[PDB]
Amino acid sequence: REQIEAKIVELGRRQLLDHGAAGLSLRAIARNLGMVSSAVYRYVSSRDELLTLLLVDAYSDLADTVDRARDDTVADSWSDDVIAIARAVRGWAVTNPARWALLYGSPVPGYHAPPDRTAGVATRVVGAFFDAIAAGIATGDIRLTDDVAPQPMSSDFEKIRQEFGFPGDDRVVTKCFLLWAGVVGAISLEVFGQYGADMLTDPGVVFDAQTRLLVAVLAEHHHHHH
Amino acid sequence: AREQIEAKIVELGRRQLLDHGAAGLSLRAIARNLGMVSSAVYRYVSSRDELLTLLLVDAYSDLADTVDRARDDTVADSWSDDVIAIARAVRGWAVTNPARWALLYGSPVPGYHAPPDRTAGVATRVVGAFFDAIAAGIATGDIRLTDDVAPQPMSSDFEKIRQEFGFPGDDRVVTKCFLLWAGVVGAISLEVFGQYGADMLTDPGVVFDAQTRLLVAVLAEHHHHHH
Numbered sequence A: 001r002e003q004i005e006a007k008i009v010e011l012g013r014r015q016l017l018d019h020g021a022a023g024l025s026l027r028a029i030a031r032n033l034g035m036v037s038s039a040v041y042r043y044v045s046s047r048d049e050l051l052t053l054l055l056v057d058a059y060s061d062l063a064d065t066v067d068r069a070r071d072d073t074v075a076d077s078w079s080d081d082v083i084a085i086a087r088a089v090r091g092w093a094v095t096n097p098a099r100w101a102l103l104y105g106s107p108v109p110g111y112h113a114p115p116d117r118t119a120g121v122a123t124r125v126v127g128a129f130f131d132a133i134a135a136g137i138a139t140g141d142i143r144l145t146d147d148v149a150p151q152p153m154s155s156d157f158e159k160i161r162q163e164f165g166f167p168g169d170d171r172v173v174t175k176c177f178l179l180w181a182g183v184v185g186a187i188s189l190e191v192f193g194q195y196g197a198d199m200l201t202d203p204g205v206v207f208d209a210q211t212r213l214l215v216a217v218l219a220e221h222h223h224h225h226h
Numbered sequence B: 001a002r003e004q005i006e007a008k009i010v011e012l013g014r015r016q017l018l019d020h021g022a023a024g025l026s027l028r029a030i031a032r033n034l035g036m037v038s039s040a041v042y043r044y045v046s047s048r049d050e051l052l053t054l055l056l057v058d059a060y061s062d063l064a065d066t067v068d069r070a071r072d073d074t075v076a077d078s079w080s081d082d083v084i085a086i087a088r089a090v091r092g093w094a095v096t097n098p099a100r101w102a103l104l105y106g107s108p109v110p111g112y113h114a115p116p117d118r119t120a121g122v123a124t125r126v127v128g129a130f131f132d133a134i135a136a137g138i139a140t141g142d143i144r145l146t147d148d149v150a151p152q153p154m155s156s157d158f159e160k161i162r163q164e165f166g167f168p169g170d171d172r173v174v175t176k177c178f179l180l181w182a183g184v185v186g187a188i189s190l191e192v193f194g195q196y197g198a199d200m201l202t203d204p205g206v207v208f209d210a211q212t213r214l215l216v217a218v219l220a221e222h223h224h225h226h227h
């Protein structure tokens, strides 16, 4: 089976590279497996199910890539950990541009990913960032200021904290959202070609410079609040 | 006479985006839903690529026009309020026009490359507005220029950017301009493309605005240290 479902995922991933989602076809996938259109449907019931399999696969590969890169190390500091994560995410997106598009690019209209399948893997990189930043809180380099956000943002953040076992207060969590948005934004601008013609000679150097600013956001205090 | 037909074609194209994305763009379907014949449509919009190009130009222009309107109702002391107002207007446009945002800043359309002679100008209008708001912060001294040089080749690339946008920054401020654009685009895309998920944030606009205020603090080096 999974030998079969594996091949489906591999095929579908190729159809993604070539035509994007529109061109997903349990029809093509069917021929290749020496199979009748109808035969495939037990393994993968529908175009949607294919899409969710392809999503879980991309998310997992990305997260495994990140996990691997953290196990590689200068354990020196939380900030070096954050940089290593960001660099791994970007490197993965640059090597897998169509799968980056799948994950963080345009939605497939008519498709809604059942969270029960996607939630877990979809938060593993987010989770890595939180884990990395939690180290900087435990060692005092990232100073909690007990600056409470208005509701309902504060209660939103409290759920997020509990989910991830993250000890950052409301300001740290705001800064984490900025970090993630900046990382995903920078990557997508590069990968999707949106800086355009002859603008950046080495987009990676610019990405690294952005990450360093985002680290400095986490490390310094911007309001008179003590 | 063409002009008015082209408009109904483009409006129906905007609808197909909403319903099928760039995939479902079809001049033939359009051609029907206007009680017209397929062969008649190519006379007004000659290909899928031309339809996409019209839809891109339309979207970039509407987005920029929305920014420009929001700035005209920031009547203010403040370069920072301007930056915040631009960012808010971009997000508002994107959430209200999510399929057109996808067309602009989402995944590339396989096989298609926008003609820079139709798209490049309008595509720089909002970036341009941010540089103009930020330049006012530099003029008043809230954003201080240094002689620090960004790591190469950034510094070299940045000189060409400052010239193109008539922006009187230094390297450091330009880096922070790239950060702001990335943060804005990135935050909007995560919300609009449905990564956040339904429940997580009660109003994502509120977190977004907090992020923009942090980006303003980065530009102005508004922080202190306990040394």
Ligand SMILES: CCCCCCCCCCCC(=O)OC(C)C
Pocket: A194, A195, A196, A197, B116, B119, B120, B121, B123, B124, B127, B128, B130, B131, B177, B178, B180, B181
């Ligand atoms: C806060 C602003 C930061 C500025 C950095 C980004 C500038 C991106 C401009 C892209 C224009 C483009 O598409 O032109 C092509 C030739 C086609």
Ligand SMILES: [Mg+2]
Pocket: A017, A095, A096, A097, A098, A099, A100
């Ligand atoms: Mg790929």
Ligand SMILES: [Mg+2]
Pocket: B018, B096, B097, B098, B099, B100, B101
């Ligand atoms: Mg729309």
Ligand code: NI
Pocket: A221, A223, A225, A226, B224, B226
């Ligand atoms: Ni302080």
Ligand code: NI
Pocket: B223, B224, B225
């Ligand atoms: Ni300082």
